[PDB]
Amino acid sequence: GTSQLAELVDAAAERLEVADPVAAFKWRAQLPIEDSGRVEQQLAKLGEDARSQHIDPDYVTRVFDDQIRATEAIEYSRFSDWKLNPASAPPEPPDLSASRSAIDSLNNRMLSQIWSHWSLLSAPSCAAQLDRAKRDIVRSRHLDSLYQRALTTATQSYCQALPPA
Amino acid sequence: GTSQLAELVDAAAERLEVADPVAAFKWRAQLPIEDSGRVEQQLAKLGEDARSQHIDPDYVTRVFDDQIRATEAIEYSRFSDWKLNPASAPPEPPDLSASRSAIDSLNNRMLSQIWSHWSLLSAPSCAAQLDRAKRDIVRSRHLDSLYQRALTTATQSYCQALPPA
Ligand SMILES: N[C@@H](Cc1c[nH]c2ccccc12)C(=O)O
Ligand SMILES: N[C@@H](Cc1c[nH]c2ccccc12)C(=O)O
């Protein structure tokens, strides 16, 4: 009763959820949500990680850009909420450096699954296995409407993996 | 069948709605939503306008800060939406300079009503007359859930006007 893509999508969902403590920290520290210099660095490092792990870097780049976009979308929604209702901004978020550490371990989890399941990601049955995984994770993580939209954005390029050679 | 605060709240609502073309323009031009230097200038000019029009500048400052916060909240929500779904970002928004001109005429409308209705704003019956106005405007302008929350934020300090002297 389980999708081969469950572990990948669970990681990706877990990494989206880090958006909440990140947004809370940045609100309190007056940091921007999007720093395009930083994102560029993050993607370039992921590309390098992909090559060293024998994964198509162009795939990783696109996929992680979807994931980062999704993450920003959540952060923006939180900022909207806290502008309307500043008393609801969490007053003691976890350290940004702890959130980044969580992110970096999740990046690795996702890369390791992308490599392992490359035949699935690149096969015609991917779209179905991904829908199944998404539904399962939305339920297991109790993802609300916002996180649901985000998870769809973050996974929208998964099934465009191409077979090698 | 009409609140004395209807004209003020209608102006304020109209000015919130300018958030949409502003957010669409800034998305396309890669401009930030919040520039705190700019906001500070905007508030300082409003304070000066208030003095010249014999309105309590401290009131105007707080009220317009609520209105600007509300406006940002809408812009942030749009940015969240367009991160998830970039195809829905309006591709040909009106000129930012036209939006600013609309804003400046609405500022004046709001200031003129604040002066005219100062006895009401500062009286115990304000809270009731404001609730009535809000409900009427939400209906007449067909304001959705987001704009409803925003209009509440933008008007939250209206009834704290104090009688002179
Ligand atoms: N779009 C801006 C929004 C923002 C959030 N926090 C900020 C702090 C400073 C300047 C801008 C911001 C950004 O991504 O940065
Ligand atoms: N919080 C940021 C968000 C933002 C929107 N557009 C931007 C463009 C550049 C930098 C930041 C932004 C701000 O208010 O600016």
Curated annotation (Swiss-Prot), chains A, B:
GO biological process terms on file: chorismate metabolic process; salicylic acid biosynthetic process
Report which residue ranges the record marks as coiled coil.
Answer: none
Which stretches are transmembrane? none
Instruction: Describe the location of the Chorismate mutase domain by residue ranges.
Output: 1-79
Report the subcellular localization: Secreted
Question: What would changing residue 38 to A do, according to UniProt?
Answer: Less than 1% of the wild-type enzyme activity
Activity regulation note: Tyrosine, phenylalanine, and tryptophan moderately enhance chorismate mutase activity at low concentrations, but allosterically inhibit the enzyme at higher concentrations.
What reaction does this catalyse? chorismate = prephenate
Q: How does activity depend on temperature?
A: Optimum temperature is between 37 to 50 degrees Celsius. An increase in temperature does increase enzyme activity, and complete reversible denaturation of the enzyme occurs at a temperature close to 60 degrees Celsius.
Q: Which cysteines are joined by disulfide bonds?
A: 126-159
This protein's pathway reads: Metabolic intermediate biosynthesis; prephenate biosynthesis; prephenate from chorismate: step 1/1
Q: Write the Enzyme Commission number(s) for this entry.
A: 5.4.99.5
**Major location category of this protein:** secreted
Keywords assigned by UniProt, alphabetized: Disulfide bond, Isomerase, Secreted, Signal
What does the miscellaneous comment read? Was identified as a high-confidence drug target. In the presence of high concentrations of tyrosine, phenylalanine, and tryptophan, the enzyme is completely protected from proteolytic degradation.
**What does the protein in this record do?**
Catalyzes the Claisen rearrangement of chorismate to prephenate. May play some role in the pathogenicity.
Q: What is this protein called?
A: Secreted chorismate mutase
Output the lineage of the source organism. Bacteria, Bacillati, Actinomycetota, Actinomycetes, Mycobacteriales
